[PDB]
């Protein structure tokens, strides 16, 4: 039992980025637009390329869209792939991801790569990155005693 | 080799944010959480094992406060980023080939 | 110098990730606190705290249900979800 | 300079206090099964814990109204001289709470009292919440990796 174990990383391509890029959203959900995510777009896509990912990205997709999407990825073969990255950068509610036109439960996408689901990621990271408020409180600043 | 592995083992969740909380933006540049994660992969992403990495993510996305607000009560106010590990293993993005 | 977030500097180790069952042997304790004192009898002054996290999950992930009343139970797995909001390195060296 | 080796400052006089909740059995009217061997876990921490340094505080099956005056005694007490508090809780849980002996309390009301505007002296030190509670009704499957 090695306490300094890694995962194997020298498969033939580092995986797939998926990222799923949401600036705004169908007006009857009344969902501010996210100025500055393609910003955030744009810097992931050249720093995930500089790490070796394919970067693949879908911009403001409907929830059957997004969902087609990601099936796919998931049942693609991750055989040759290190590990798979998706990120999520939209509003969200509860355990909820909002696509265009309306929102999805994080775990049916989540689901998708689980072990039983995705046979070539098993042994390997999946990695999910969500930029989204997650509740109505804003955190306070404090100090330490110290100072 | 001898042992089977949970379906939910290996994944790990990154967020910009705990639950219950807002995250924050600049506007111009993007979301604090994104600006500090891609500057984290520029300058660690090809050595520094990628929770270590996430965990200067929090301190840097923790230095932030709001500095400009329509709401007067939210100036000064702050974010700290979360993740959740299920990795079994230490994870790196070294260079390929 | 920099305020910090309130909410900032906390770590939740919780036996299992939301959604699911955690488990136990027979008599011994939960599967999650056998394996997490483990490691931490080995390696607790010397790792970074999530570095032992993590091979308290690579642990857990190894157990199975041997014996349920419940024969769909049998052969089940868990693995625990450590949560960071920590801002540095946690070690706890010998003081 | 930003130090990426940077460590939390742990050479203050104590290691600080680690709190156990240990709960086995529950009031007859939560219809709650037993906990048959957290005896075991509660003593291989308190023995782990107190090798680190902590103050190791064990509490078994405490009510509601215990279980919180006593968390809330030690949210209010200064850590000023301590390196990090501990709190562990062995029990059964609910959704976003954990069971008392006699009720179920707000995950949130207790890691609440050890934020930075509550608990001044842990301000810009490491909180660490175990928590040994099953949190929903599935059992994860095992798999294999392909090959
Ligand atoms: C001054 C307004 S505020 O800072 O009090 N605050 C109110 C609550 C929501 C906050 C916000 O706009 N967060 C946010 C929106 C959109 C994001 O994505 C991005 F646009 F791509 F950056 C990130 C964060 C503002
Ligand atoms: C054979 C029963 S099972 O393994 O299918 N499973 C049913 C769902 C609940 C599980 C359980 O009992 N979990 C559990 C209870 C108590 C724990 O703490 C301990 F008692 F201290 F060990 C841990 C896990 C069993
Ligand atoms: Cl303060
Ligand atoms: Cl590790
Ligand atoms: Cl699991
Ligand atoms: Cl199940």
Redesign the pocket.
């Given at each position: 039992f090695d306490p300094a174990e890694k995962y194997k990383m020298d498969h033939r391509r580092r995986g797939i980025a998926l990222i799923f890029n949401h600036?705004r959203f169908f007006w009857h959900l009344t969902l501010?637009?996210?100025?500055?995510?393609?910003?955030?777009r744009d810097n992931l896509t050249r720093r995930f390329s500089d790490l070796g990912f394919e970067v693949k990205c879908f911009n403001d997709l409907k929830a059957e869209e997004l969902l087609l999407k990601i099936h796919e990825v998931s049942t693609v073969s991750h055989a040759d792939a290190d590990c798979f990255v998706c990120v999520f950068?939209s509003?969200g509610e509860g355990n909820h991801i909002y696509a265009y036109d309306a929102k999805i439960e994080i775990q049916t996408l989540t689901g998708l790569f689980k072990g039983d689901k995705c046979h070539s990621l098993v042994g390997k990271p999946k990695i999910f990155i969500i930029?989204?408020?997650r509740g109505?409180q804003?955190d306070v600043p404090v100090i330490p005693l110290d100072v | 080799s001898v042992y089977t592995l949970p379906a939910g083992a290996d994944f790990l969740m990154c967020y910009?944010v705990a639950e219950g909380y807002?995250?924050?933006?600049?506007?111009v540049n993007?979301?604090?959480?994104?600006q500090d994660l891609c500057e984290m992969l520029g300058k660690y992403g090809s050595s520094l094992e990628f929770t270590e990495l996430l965990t200067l993510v929090n301190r840097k996305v923790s230095q932030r406060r709001?500095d400009?607000?329509?709401?007067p009560?939210?100036?000064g106010?702050k974010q700290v980023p979360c993740f959740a590990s299920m990795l079994t293993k230490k994870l790196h993005f070294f260079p390929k080939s």
């Open positions: 600036e501010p637009e996210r100025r500055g995510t393609c910003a955030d950068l509003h930029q989204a408020c109505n804003h | 910009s807002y995250s924050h933006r600049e506007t993007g979301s604090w959480y994104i709001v400009f607000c329509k709401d009560s939210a100036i106010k």
